[PDB]
Each structure stands twice: as C-alpha cells, then as structure tokens.
Amino acid sequence: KVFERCELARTLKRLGMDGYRGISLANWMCLAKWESGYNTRATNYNAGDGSTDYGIFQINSRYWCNDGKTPGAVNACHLSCSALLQDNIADAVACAKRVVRDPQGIRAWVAWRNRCQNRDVRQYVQGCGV
Ligand code: NA
Numbered sequence: 001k002v003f004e005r006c007e008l009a010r011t012l013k014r015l016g017m018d019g020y021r022g023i024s025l026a027n028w029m030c031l032a033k034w035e036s037g038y039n040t041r042a043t044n045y046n047a048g049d050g051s052t053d054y055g056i057f058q059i060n061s062r063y064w065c066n067d068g069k070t071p072g073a074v075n076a077c078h079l080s081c082s083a084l085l086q087d088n089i090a091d092a093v094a095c096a097k098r099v100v101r102d103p104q105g106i107r108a109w110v111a112w113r114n115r116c117q118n119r120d121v122r123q124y125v126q127g128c129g130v
Pocket of ligand 1: 065066070
C-alpha cells in the first residue's frame with residue numbers, strides 16, 4: 001500500500017507516534033517519505049552484509065527482524081520481516097518504536113539526518129487534522 005500524506009499522518013497518530021520518545025509526528029512522516037515514499041512493501045537489498053531493509057520505515061534485517069537469510073543477524077523487534085511488509089502498519093510502528101528506544105533515537109536512520117534534522121518538517125502534517 002502507498003499511503004496518501006494526510007492518510008498516513010492520521011494513521012500514525014492513532015498508533016501513538018505523535019511525540020513518542022520526544023519525536024513529533026512530522027518527523028515520523030518525513031522519515032517515511034524519504035525512506036519508502038510511504039510504500040509499505042518497499043524493500044532494499046544490501047549485498048554487502050546480506051541484509052534487507054523492509055517496509056515503510058525501511059527497518060534492517062541484521063538487527064530488527066528475522067528473514068532467515070541474513071548471516072549472523074538478530075531479531076530485536078521479535079518479528080518476521082514479513083510483518084513489516086503488511087498493508088496494516090501496526091507491527092511496523094511497534095518496531096519503529098523499539099528502534100528509537102535505543103541510544104540514537106530517531107538518528108538511527110541516516111536518511112532522517114539528511115532530509116529531516118535541523119529543518120522545519122511541519123509541512124508533512126499541515127492540513128491533515130493532527
Ligand atoms: Na534478523
């Protein structure tokens with residue numbers, strides 16, 4: 001599923017993302033935009049370490065989910081990476097929350113640092129009623 005902007009804004013809000021561990025909704029929106037273009041079945045293979053980035057938040061298999069084919073990986077979110085390719089994003093949101101509970105927080109994603117950090121991201125939620 002490829003979400004419309006405001007459609008995603010309200011979906012994330014209903015899932016408890018607005019201000020989670022201090023991260024505004026607009027930051028979560030900006031992250032999803034640059035990571036996947038709001039596409040829940042987006043995937044990216046990294047031949048180097050045999051890992052794959054899954055879903056709307058492009059969460060990596062070396063640490064967060066199990067796909068069975070990533071050498072010496074772990075499963076911190078305790079989910080099959082398939083759960084991160086569902087049209088319903090509740091499981092992906094639970095995993096993104098687990099990711100930010102680590103030391104780096106939202107900085108865990110390099111795309112956030114490049115396209116969202118030190119910028120006014122309010123434009124991602126403007127007009128969505130959130
Ligand atoms: Na894994």
